[PDB]
A = this chain, B = another copy of it.
């Protein structure tokens, strides 16, 4: 039976093989990405029974997504190729670090997602349903879907996990704020970064007061992070490693924290776990390439 279920829009990442401006490259590497996706994979790699829900176009890129998911062991009960196209994007990491991103996903088969996108009973018996603030920002359908989705998970005694992920590209801090204030009630687990808190509540302080979910984790760059449960605030291990491709650590981290919880581990181990994931993906090129496999933890144990 599935332990975790996530949902979102899959995207294909195109990335240069080395730092520098995209304008100058002539060879791009192809990777499969998408927050929720990055997360499903990570979990899948750790032995967690997880299912992904989403759509992709009936194009070669869609096929690729599917193969990849299927290969990783993700449950695609409610995932399929549909008329339309698959969203993709181009990335570029500058020498001194200033990255920039370009999207080509508006109107993709995957950005459809509307309430009822799958059969709710799917959620039954499941531990968690994870989502990203990116999905609801795509379209009003999605927005609705999202609300609908956790509503249903709640209704089924399924824990709702949410990684804020504010994309200025998709919407305003006000809209984002509006969304959250409407959504928070149904959230049990929330993932957030400092910038995001600052950028939407002025200070990482107010944000906490406002968004007081049962459990909230705050990513704080390389300064570890803090977990907030039972009025308690455990701090996580900070990491002195340099980013290779920090483009998916955020998701890896969450996944990591998720796996811990799914295994009913003390907040300390969950964090520990989460950085471990984040670290690994950050240390590798690709959205979720670098995500470790269960047997790795085992040896590392």
Interface residues of A in 193-220 (CB under 8 A from B): none
A72 to B28, CA, bound (A): 21
By the criterion CB–CB under 8 Å, are B102 and A59 in contact? yes
Do A22 and B61 have beta carbons less than 8 Å apart? yes
Query: Does A184 sit within 8 A of B, measured CB to CB?
Result: no
Cβ of A265 under 8 Å from chain B:
no
Q: What residues on B are CB-neighbors of A177 within 8 Å?
A: none
Contact A67 B72 (CB under 8 A): yes
The reply to whether B30 and A284 form a contact with Cβ atoms under 8 Å apart is: no
Q: Are B60 and A19 in contact (CB under 8 A)?
A: no
Interface residue A58 (Cβ < 8 Å from any Cβ of B): yes
Residue A232 interfacial (CB < 8 Å)? no
Q: How far is the CA of A104 from the CA of B24 in the complex (A)?
A: 20
| In contact, B95 and A280 (Cβ under 8 angstroms) | yes
A290 in the interface (beta carbon within 8 A): yes
Integer count of this chain's copies in the complex: 6
Q: Which of A95, A244, A296, A300 has the most CB of B within 10 A?
A: A95
Interface check A68, CB cutoff 8 A: yes
Most chain-B Cβ atoms within 10 A of its Cβ — which of A58, A68, A72, A296? Answer: A296
A287 at the interface (CB under 8 A from B): no
Contact of A23 among B21, B64, B95, B244 (CB under 8 A): B64
Which of A3-42 touch B at CB < 8 Å?
14, 18-31
| Residues A95 and B279 in contact in the complex (CB < 8 Å), given A71-B70, A295-B58 | yes
With A20-B284, A21-B63 given, can you name 4 additional A-B contacts, CB distance below 8 Å? A23-B60, A27-B27, A70-B70, A70-B71
15 example contacts (A-B, Cβ-Cβ < 8 A) are as follows A18-B284, A18-B285, A19-B290, A20-B284, A21-B63, A22-B59, A23-B61, A24-B64, A24-B67, A60-B92, A61-B90, A61-B102, A95-B279, A98-B299, A98-B300
A279 CB contacts on chain B under 8 angstroms: 95-96
From B63, B67, B85, B100, A60 is in contact (CB under 8 Å) with B100
Task: Assess whether A283 is interfacial by the CB under 8 Å rule.
Answer: yes
Most buried by B among A73, A241, A284, A300: A284
**Residue pair A104, B92 in contact (C-beta under 8 Å):** no
A96 contacts B300, C-beta separation under 8 Å: yes
Known: A64-B22, A70-B73. A283 touches B96 (CB 8 A): yes
Asked whether A104 lies within 8 Å of B88 as measured between CB atoms, the reply is yes
Query: Which residues from 259 to 291 on chain A have a C-beta closer than 8 Å to any C-beta of chain B?
Result: 276, 279-281, 283-285, 289-290
